[model samples]
Target chain A: PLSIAELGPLNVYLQIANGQCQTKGCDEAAAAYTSFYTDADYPVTKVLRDPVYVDVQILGRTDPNLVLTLGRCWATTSPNAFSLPQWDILIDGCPYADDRYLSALVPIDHSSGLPFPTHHSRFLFKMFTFVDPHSMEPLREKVYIHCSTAACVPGQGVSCEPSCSR
Target chain B: VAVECREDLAHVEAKKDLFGIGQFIDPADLTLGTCPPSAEDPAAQVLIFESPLQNCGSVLTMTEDSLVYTFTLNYNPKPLGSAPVVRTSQAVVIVECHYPRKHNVSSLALDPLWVPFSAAKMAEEFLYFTLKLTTDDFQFERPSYQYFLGDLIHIEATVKQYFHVPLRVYVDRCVATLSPDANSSPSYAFIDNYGCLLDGRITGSDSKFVSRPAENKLDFQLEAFRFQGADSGMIYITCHLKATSAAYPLDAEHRACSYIQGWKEVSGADPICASCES
Candidate 1:
């Protein structure tokens, strides 16, 4: 009596296209490109110097019991989303150890459905790349950011928030 | 600790790293000239011997500068479990810290123990560090060395980051000895295991890192104690201080912990402090 989307492994998206839409609405320059993208759409245009906002959301099953949480996040130049020479921006839901730029998480709004409708998480960071060890020169052409996200049951001896007390 | 001895009660205090030297020594086997300070005491792991200075086999000498009261604080090696005393090596810490006799004894000022600016190399660059004996409140520069037992001594260690990036200071290890040499024997390592205050754990003393108000500075407190079986009431504390770039997150390998019911981190609430129990 129910469709596959009704009882299923929820589809999660990175909402990188509408990522420009922040708390204060998309800036005038970024508002020009307002289309949302999916996992199939890679290599989203991003400026290296400006701050990059990442938003993640889950579809289906807004049961309120299942809380969404994020984990380690890293940037790579590989398209396979699994490659070497990676730089971590977040670790265990907190900023990466030795992260000088202070990459951090952004609180979620359960009321707004702009990104994922409900049970969404987000973070903020700047685009960066690895450098050559020997030559001491910058390496890699494009940046591919990857993150690990999970949904947990609320009030079951588990917290969906990051522990950044350190 | 200060020197004010009477005929019947000559105060002597000493501390040992019962944890570090647990293999060879136990707190029960230590003595001050055959006068046992305590078999067990809740105040602190440090043995506080209050005996008659002249009667408890003290050596009194009138030097040109002052009156020196000397006592021998020795560790008698004992075998485990009903074992007899052996002729093994006996560890001894010479206690000759305090002296009385000066024209202006009342106005005698205590000089803060200063660790000169030493070069700390990082990323092929240089950083300078200084450690000083400070006041109890950390407000003044230095207080007189004269202190009754159980008094608190505050210490401050800071770094000059020059042109380098921001860095956090850490007191890696601190050793208290009868002499100025940090490597002196029969010394008590109050701070070790990379910033864990052992004194707070063992003796339940209030020894701990108080604060890091600045990225380059850190403050700690140590309870005043004397060398047991020793004549003078003075001890030298030498600490190995270090600093790392502030960008690095605090981990078990780098932290300052104080035992309050359990090990509590002085700076941030990082779970790394649990490692102190080991």
Candidate 2:
């Protein structure tokens, strides 16, 4: 009974997307290009800000190989803190598989990583490969999930509503 | 005189009458002649029976101008004995004057700013000779000679890149090569032939590499490479220079950079490479 739409923002979300939406018959269109999806509820309106913002991008193929990436931006001030927009990936309203445990874990912040900051600043692709249920073969069609965040002023806080555009 | 009277007269008839009566002569009749000087002198009288005395005539004389004295000893004489001995007189000549000048000059070619003789080369050489003799036949004793005072005279030379460059050459390595065993006696290895490997890269230089004056003279500590089977090795030197760019023209200025170079022995234990392994 645990559907993909039921997954909260803490578990999955949209990272960076082209401002325009091209999903057919959807009203929340911003740009004409790419978009990311996760299994979280409110996917669109979240703005990933400075300080600590998780920005995920789908680099390579994601269908047979659902390669998901996770990047983090640290928080500086409270009102303009980093944020990640909510998202959900649903196959007939069932949530996408939880693959967090399979991917390599790289530290996003410079201070809190292993073999610590003695080397470099940014941490890159910690990946996971998705396989077909029956054939046990890597799903070839590219599918991706990403995460990101943004900030807004407190009293004039922006609406966190998910909208559909043409 | 009246008849010589009877002086004879007494004897004429007296013998007949008396028993053993004889004529007596007077003692004043004999006179002694004067003695000769040889017989008169007491010393001459005492030495008359002994051997003849020797006459000491002046043989040779030396003047103050002569620089050397040479003499020959009579090799035939059994110089050691106690008897009525005949000794060839020993002739000796003494020369007085100025001290001899020493002509031993040891020089070294070095990078600019390095002083070769700054440390105790004299003491080191002395100790080296002493050790050599002690380990060898001990037939030759170590000589005691006064050490000469050393000095560094700066020679100014101009290079194309830099002007008024100050350089000094310093003495770095003067060590004996010996086996690792505690009991091994060390020997003096030539500084030039000393097994040192200098792998250096010149980041930059003042003027030219050969004759031009260098602005800075740098040095590095020589390290032993025990692992490379090298009995002896050294990390010749490390120098620093400045980074180069298109805008910056190479001049006589010593820049900021670093390099390592030196010599090492092919034999002996190999040096350890701790940095190589992960």
**What is the fnat of model 2 with respect to the true interface contacts?**
0.00
lDDT of 1 by residue, B195-266 (tens): 888888888887777768788888888877777787877688888877899998787766787786677675
Per-residue accuracy of model 2 over B32-102 as CA lDDT, tens digit each? 11111111223321111111011011111122321111111111223336774634422222111111111
Q: Candidate 1 iRMS, in Å? A: 37.5
Candidate 2 Cα deviation (angstroms), residue A75? 25
Judged by whole-model lDDT over C-alpha atoms, candidate 2 comes out at: 0.22
CA lDDT scores, all candidates in order:
0.62, 0.22
- Candidate 1's TM-score reads 0.34
RMSD of 2: 67.9
Largest lDDT belongs to which candidate? 1
Quote the TM-score that chain A achieves in each candidate: 0.73, 0.22
